[PDB]
């Protein structure tokens, strides 16, 4: 289990005619693991503040707002909110 096939699908969406080396794809996969863990650990700390046994979209969203720099955070929240709204309406 890695994110690499999914990274590759996103690469071809944003740059249809640009490829990627093995080591570059390793670096990309490591970024996704690193941010996954940062956001999961912050979500864990928030859930404890709230005495909450479940991590929900509310904790992920707050984790994104605290961990990501401001402009990336604003756009990431827009994307996460959009995906959950599309999922709920499917």
């Amino acid at each position: 289990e890695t994110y690499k096939i999914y990274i590759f699908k996103v690469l071809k969406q944003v740059h249809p005619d640009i490829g990627i080396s093995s080591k570059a794809m390793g670096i990309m996969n490591s970024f996704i693991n690193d941010i996954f863990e940062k956001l999961a650990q912050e979500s864990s700390k928030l859930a404890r503040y709230n005495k909450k046994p479940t991590i929900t979209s509310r904790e992920i969203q707050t984790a994104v707002r605290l961990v990501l720099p401001g402009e990336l955070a604003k756009h990431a929240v827009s994307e996460g909110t959009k995906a959950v709204t599309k999922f709920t309406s499917s």
Binding site: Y3, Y6, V14, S57, I60, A83, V84, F87
Partner: protein, 89 residues
């Protein structure tokens, strides 16, 4: 059968992300929306880095991203540098 990724408009794997969230015991349980939200955020960040790294590849007269393109794209971006740290090659 229709994937949670497909329902959410995503490429990133919602099911796999849900499994990683549950496996790590960040809390007792994980809600249905949390993995969708997190998958969307990780997909957005991948797209942002790939956009900038691929622009660096092309500016560098290449047709594929190598580690130095990622290093340059990230080092030239205040926010990605803050989030991801220095890329070491």
């Amino acid at each position: 059968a229709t994937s949670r990724s497909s329902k959410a408009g995503l490429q990133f794997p919602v099911g796999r992300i849900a499994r990683f969230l549950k496996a790590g015991k960040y809390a007792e349980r994980v809600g249905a929306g949390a993995p969708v939200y997190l998958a969307a955020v990780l997909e957005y960040l991948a797209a942002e880095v790939l956009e900038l790294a691929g622009n660096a590849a092309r500016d560098n007269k290449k047709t594929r991203i190598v580690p130095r393109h990622i290093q340059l794209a990230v080092r030239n971006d205040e926010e990605l540098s803050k989030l991801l740290g220095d890329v070491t090659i």
